[PDB]
């Protein structure tokens, strides 16, 4: 490269940092949805209607324009060449920045071994959960609902591990009227939110929750509620079962604790292998690098394939996800 | 563009975020310096010598590789096509990420008018100082020393506004043996660090520090020493004198409080005008957008040029900085 191409590419990397953060902000602030509707918006009017500091709004849109997501035209912002694709993945930018941004920012302090004890990094838990809700729906839904449609039976009681919001149980309950739901979650506030939402939507006597660690499900004393369960679901947390030896034991314990489960639908993103550095897709590098910074295990697709039998399960169908790195839904029984 | 081009462009945007944050980290951890000296390093060797968590180290270089700053070949990392440019500007990336990242991450919380009271954003001050030390040396020093070389007299007492770590005063004292220095800084902590630094370097009896706000310099008590000053310097903070009416009055106050000043050397970065969005150079977008988010004024070059006479000074020479957005050093008298 000439010196001028290098100048441009490095300016682009810099401005990309700001665009990236602005994608998640423009999502959260409602700008991306206004642009989808009308293909354009008026900067001052947007600022006034949302009661925002307008010079900062102008910077937000400039950042987006600097890399081609939007285009500024006098007083208006118009969708740009990368708008549909950036908007498609917005929840992943939000996860990277608003969610995980402190982690990455603190790279020089997280890498040194002497610092890697106790609480050595900070995530924004509320932000991560704001993004994960749309990730779950946008990337995992087609395959999740394809798996539900090949169950070959009508579930009667569904249990969801890492139930969070309760949203999956509510959606299963809208599709299977009078199905019962049970959500297991390790956080009493994820439980409290889920209970409110379920009641708010008129399901408080179909769906209940239990505080519980899915990794050691034998320590939860809801046997008998567990014994009713004929469908088990676990999305976006499977990798926390690892390393391999712990995963095997978690899987065996889940098999014992839900002895009437027919299908177990397990969905997660995985560590990729061998992708060339200049062709990394969206999400991959952040997911993998983040977990390596936090010291947390991330298995590959092959590692999952290789663990089910030892863990007490048989994989009878597997769905590729589009494309949240390499992500999958396994149908186990 | 095709969907493929857009897919690629949005992925690069995502990855640039991680590479961006990695530039600063790789500076601070010593990787960029090692790669500048040898053109390459060995990832495991590097991690052992620096006692870093190697999976995170690999992640760091991978980030840098994903946008062409380095290349990975087996177990080694090698300089890539944008290495010289990114290394040149590494302190700007550090400033954006390590220093200012929490500002830009919190864009959804900082933009709403109802959040904008009290402490509504958070910068990392030690990080900002670490980066500012190199920004001063790498971008400002040549114009600074040129202005010192054209003073047309030999200073006897120098005052530095926003003295920081005391480094500029130490360097002046090395240039003019026997000159006295006086640093004014608003932050007690800068005073204490500067005093320790100066004592350690042996300039304890020549350089002193007084806590005070250069925007209200008429209120700073400095044992009558201001009247002995014959050179005044102020780098990287002049924009904090603005808006214009405050700047006029601060400049008059400085003229009256340092009546024996001959030259006043003023160096700062400025707000640009009319740069096309897709042509923003490095730094420019962050510096401007950051100040707008913070609610702080940033003047253009023309605004400076047009304030001096009313403020009681004459500009007799002006130096262009090479490329820190649009930055300059004014020589005033
Ligand atoms: N070991 C564990 N046992 C139970 N819940 C867990 C867990 N590890 C994480 N969680 C919970 O699972 C959620 C992870 S996010 C996944 C949310 C949900 N499955 C969805 O598709 O949106 C959080 O609510 C967290 O509290
Ligand atoms: N109004 C004000 N009066 C005095 N010092 C100020 C100030 N606003 C900012 N500062 C100080 O200015 C320093 C800015 S960093 C710039 C440091 C130095 N002039 C250099 O070139 O390297 C900090 O220590 C901060 O405390
Ligand atoms: C908390 O959810 C996030 C997620 C994102 C994509 C796939 C799986 C999980 C992530 O921070 C996690 O590792 O659990
Ligand atoms: C703290 O120094 C920084 C700087 C960088 C370049 C030019 C001017 C100022 C910046 O955060 C500031 O506005 O004071
Ligand atoms: O090994 C696998 O590929 C999957 O884990 C599940 C599977 C196996 C065989 C046939 C279909 C699905
Ligand atoms: O107006 C200007 O450009 C500068 O602020 C100072 C200058 C003016 C005239 C000749 C030289 C320097
Ligand atoms: Ca309009
Ligand atoms: Ca464009
Ligand atoms: Ca921490
Ligand atoms: Ca791609
Ligand atoms: Ca080597
Ligand atoms: Ca390359
Ligand atoms: Ca004062
Ligand atoms: Ca002019
Ligand atoms: Fe995780
Ligand atoms: Fe500033």
PDB file of N, CA, C and O and ligand atoms in Angstrom, chain B residues 92 95 100 123 128-129 132 135 140 235-240 267-270 283 287 291 294 296 298 324 327, ligand 4:
ATOM      1  N   UNK B  92      -3.297   8.161  19.792  1.00  0.00           N
ATOM      2  CA  UNK B  92      -4.648   8.641  19.523  1.00  0.00           C
ATOM      3  C   UNK B  92      -5.671   7.599  19.717  1.00  0.00           C
ATOM      4  O   UNK B  92      -6.749   7.856  20.266  1.00  0.00           O
ATOM      5  N   UNK B  95      -5.962   7.213  23.436  1.00  0.00           N
ATOM      6  CA  UNK B  95      -6.820   8.298  23.897  1.00  0.00           C
ATOM      7  C   UNK B  95      -8.300   7.985  23.687  1.00  0.00           C
ATOM      8  O   UNK B  95      -9.155   8.217  24.564  1.00  0.00           O
ATOM      9  N   UNK B 100     -10.836   7.562  26.723  1.00  0.00           N
ATOM     10  CA  UNK B 100     -12.183   8.122  26.509  1.00  0.00           C
ATOM     11  C   UNK B 100     -13.276   7.103  26.280  1.00  0.00           C
ATOM     12  O   UNK B 100     -14.412   7.471  25.981  1.00  0.00           O
ATOM     13  N   UNK B 123     -14.188   9.703  32.424  1.00  0.00           N
ATOM     14  CA  UNK B 123     -13.004   9.517  31.626  1.00  0.00           C
ATOM     15  C   UNK B 123     -12.000   8.826  32.490  1.00  0.00           C
ATOM     16  O   UNK B 123     -12.026   8.980  33.704  1.00  0.00           O
ATOM     17  N   UNK B 128      -5.689   8.982  30.141  1.00  0.00           N
ATOM     18  CA  UNK B 128      -5.656  10.189  29.296  1.00  0.00           C
ATOM     19  C   UNK B 128      -4.254  10.794  29.412  1.00  0.00           C
ATOM     20  O   UNK B 128      -3.582  11.103  28.397  1.00  0.00           O
ATOM     21  N   UNK B 129      -3.748  10.871  30.640  1.00  0.00           N
ATOM     22  CA  UNK B 129      -2.365  11.397  30.850  1.00  0.00           C
ATOM     23  C   UNK B 129      -1.285  10.616  30.188  1.00  0.00           C
ATOM     24  O   UNK B 129      -0.387  11.205  29.558  1.00  0.00           O
ATOM     25  N   UNK B 132      -1.658  11.499  26.420  1.00  0.00           N
ATOM     26  CA  UNK B 132      -1.278  12.921  26.245  1.00  0.00           C
ATOM     27  C   UNK B 132       0.224  13.139  26.300  1.00  0.00           C
ATOM     28  O   UNK B 132       0.791  13.966  25.532  1.00  0.00           O
ATOM     29  N   UNK B 135       1.205  12.320  22.870  1.00  0.00           N
ATOM     30  CA  UNK B 135       0.605  13.237  21.856  1.00  0.00           C
ATOM     31  C   UNK B 135       1.450  14.538  21.919  1.00  0.00           C
ATOM     32  O   UNK B 135       1.816  15.097  20.902  1.00  0.00           O
ATOM     33  N   UNK B 140       3.250  17.844  18.980  1.00  0.00           N
ATOM     34  CA  UNK B 140       3.531  19.259  19.278  1.00  0.00           C
ATOM     35  C   UNK B 140       4.988  19.650  19.413  1.00  0.00           C
ATOM     36  O   UNK B 140       5.332  20.818  19.145  1.00  0.00           O
ATOM     37  N   UNK B 235      -0.332  24.500  26.381  1.00  0.00           N
ATOM     38  CA  UNK B 235      -0.520  23.420  25.426  1.00  0.00           C
ATOM     39  C   UNK B 235      -1.653  22.460  25.819  1.00  0.00           C
ATOM     40  O   UNK B 235      -1.750  21.962  26.974  1.00  0.00           O
ATOM     41  N   UNK B 236      -2.451  22.206  24.814  1.00  0.00           N
ATOM     42  CA  UNK B 236      -3.520  21.211  24.809  1.00  0.00           C
ATOM     43  C   UNK B 236      -4.704  21.535  25.785  1.00  0.00           C
ATOM     44  O   UNK B 236      -5.451  20.644  26.188  1.00  0.00           O
ATOM     45  N   UNK B 237      -4.863  22.790  26.176  1.00  0.00           N
ATOM     46  CA  UNK B 237      -5.991  23.133  26.983  1.00  0.00           C
ATOM     47  C   UNK B 237      -6.651  24.452  26.572  1.00  0.00           C
ATOM     48  O   UNK B 237      -7.621  24.793  27.166  1.00  0.00           O
ATOM     49  N   UNK B 238      -6.171  25.147  25.545  1.00  0.00           N
ATOM     50  CA  UNK B 238      -6.701  26.492  25.295  1.00  0.00           C
ATOM     51  C   UNK B 238      -8.202  26.531  24.992  1.00  0.00           C
ATOM     52  O   UNK B 238      -8.881  27.549  25.259  1.00  0.00           O
ATOM     53  N   UNK B 239      -8.702  25.435  24.388  1.00  0.00           N
ATOM     54  CA  UNK B 239     -10.127  25.319  24.046  1.00  0.00           C
ATOM     55  C   UNK B 239     -10.987  25.445  25.313  1.00  0.00           C
ATOM     56  O   UNK B 239     -12.104  25.942  25.248  1.00  0.00           O
ATOM     57  N   UNK B 240     -10.426  25.096  26.476  1.00  0.00           N
ATOM     58  CA  UNK B 240     -11.148  25.272  27.769  1.00  0.00           C
ATOM     59  C   UNK B 240     -11.312  26.733  28.212  1.00  0.00           C
ATOM     60  O   UNK B 240     -11.989  26.996  29.147  1.00  0.00           O
ATOM     61  N   UNK B 267      -0.576  26.222  22.016  1.00  0.00           N
ATOM     62  CA  UNK B 267      -0.701  25.042  21.165  1.00  0.00           C
ATOM     63  C   UNK B 267      -1.953  24.268  21.515  1.00  0.00           C
ATOM     64  O   UNK B 267      -2.243  24.030  22.693  1.00  0.00           O
ATOM     65  N   UNK B 268      -2.741  23.947  20.499  1.00  0.00           N
ATOM     66  CA  UNK B 268      -3.957  23.171  20.693  1.00  0.00           C
ATOM     67  C   UNK B 268      -4.445  22.560  19.395  1.00  0.00           C
ATOM     68  O   UNK B 268      -4.015  22.963  18.312  1.00  0.00           O
ATOM     69  N   UNK B 269      -5.347  21.586  19.565  1.00  0.00           N
ATOM     70  CA  UNK B 269      -6.126  21.017  18.492  1.00  0.00           C
ATOM     71  C   UNK B 269      -7.440  21.848  18.373  1.00  0.00           C
ATOM     72  O   UNK B 269      -7.878  22.450  19.350  1.00  0.00           O
ATOM     73  N   UNK B 270      -8.004  21.911  17.164  1.00  0.00           N
ATOM     74  CA  UNK B 270      -9.153  22.774  16.890  1.00  0.00           C
ATOM     75  C   UNK B 270     -10.267  21.974  16.191  1.00  0.00           C
ATOM     76  O   UNK B 270     -10.049  20.852  15.748  1.00  0.00           O
ATOM     77  N   UNK B 283      -8.397  10.924  14.473  1.00  0.00           N
ATOM     78  CA  UNK B 283      -8.577  11.775  15.626  1.00  0.00           C
ATOM     79  C   UNK B 283      -9.747  12.777  15.558  1.00  0.00           C
ATOM     80  O   UNK B 283     -10.473  12.915  16.525  1.00  0.00           O
ATOM     81  N   UNK B 287     -12.282  13.696  18.685  1.00  0.00           N
ATOM     82  CA  UNK B 287     -11.981  14.847  19.478  1.00  0.00           C
ATOM     83  C   UNK B 287     -13.203  15.741  19.496  1.00  0.00           C
ATOM     84  O   UNK B 287     -13.662  16.142  20.556  1.00  0.00           O
ATOM     85  N   UNK B 291     -16.002  16.100  22.631  1.00  0.00           N
ATOM     86  CA  UNK B 291     -16.290  17.408  23.247  1.00  0.00           C
ATOM     87  C   UNK B 291     -17.774  17.751  23.166  1.00  0.00           C
ATOM     88  O   UNK B 291     -18.327  18.279  24.163  1.00  0.00           O
ATOM     89  N   UNK B 294     -19.479  15.809  25.778  1.00  0.00           N
ATOM     90  CA  UNK B 294     -19.172  16.367  27.083  1.00  0.00           C
ATOM     91  C   UNK B 294     -19.797  17.710  27.300  1.00  0.00           C
ATOM     92  O   UNK B 294     -19.753  18.187  28.380  1.00  0.00           O
ATOM     93  N   UNK B 296     -18.726  20.587  25.830  1.00  0.00           N
ATOM     94  CA  UNK B 296     -17.670  21.538  25.970  1.00  0.00           C
ATOM     95  C   UNK B 296     -17.371  22.187  24.667  1.00  0.00           C
ATOM     96  O   UNK B 296     -17.307  21.524  23.624  1.00  0.00           O
ATOM     97  N   UNK B 298     -15.383  23.865  21.551  1.00  0.00           N
ATOM     98  CA  UNK B 298     -14.199  23.660  20.779  1.00  0.00           C
ATOM     99  C   UNK B 298     -14.221  24.628  19.613  1.00  0.00           C
ATOM    100  O   UNK B 298     -15.054  24.511  18.677  1.00  0.00           O
ATOM    101  N   UNK B 324      -2.612  16.008  13.432  1.00  0.00           N
ATOM    102  CA  UNK B 324      -3.445  15.786  14.575  1.00  0.00           C
ATOM    103  C   UNK B 324      -4.713  16.583  14.277  1.00  0.00           C
ATOM    104  O   UNK B 324      -4.835  17.723  14.726  1.00  0.00           O
ATOM    105  N   UNK B 327      -4.363  21.036  14.080  1.00  0.00           N
ATOM    106  CA  UNK B 327      -3.777  21.567  15.299  1.00  0.00           C
ATOM    107  C   UNK B 327      -2.719  22.648  14.928  1.00  0.00           C
ATOM    108  O   UNK B 327      -2.104  22.606  13.841  1.00  0.00           O
TER     109      UNK B 327
HETATM  110  C1  LIG C   4      -6.230  15.971  28.159  1.00  0.00           C
HETATM  111  O1  LIG C   4      -5.691  16.241  26.844  1.00  0.00           O
HETATM  112  C2  LIG C   4      -6.462  15.861  25.651  1.00  0.00           C
HETATM  113  C3  LIG C   4      -6.019  16.584  24.388  1.00  0.00           C
HETATM  114  C4  LIG C   4      -5.579  15.862  23.263  1.00  0.00           C
HETATM  115  C5  LIG C   4      -5.200  16.545  22.081  1.00  0.00           C
HETATM  116  C6  LIG C   4      -5.310  17.934  21.975  1.00  0.00           C
HETATM  117  C7  LIG C   4      -5.798  18.679  23.053  1.00  0.00           C
HETATM  118  C8  LIG C   4      -6.150  18.002  24.243  1.00  0.00           C
HETATM  119  C9  LIG C   4      -8.042  16.074  25.633  1.00  0.00           C
HETATM  120  O2  LIG C   4      -8.747  15.062  26.371  1.00  0.00           O
HETATM  121  C10 LIG C   4      -8.573  17.501  26.023  1.00  0.00           C
HETATM  122  O3  LIG C   4      -9.544  18.021  25.392  1.00  0.00           O
HETATM  123  O4  LIG C   4      -8.009  18.169  26.964  1.00  0.00           O
END
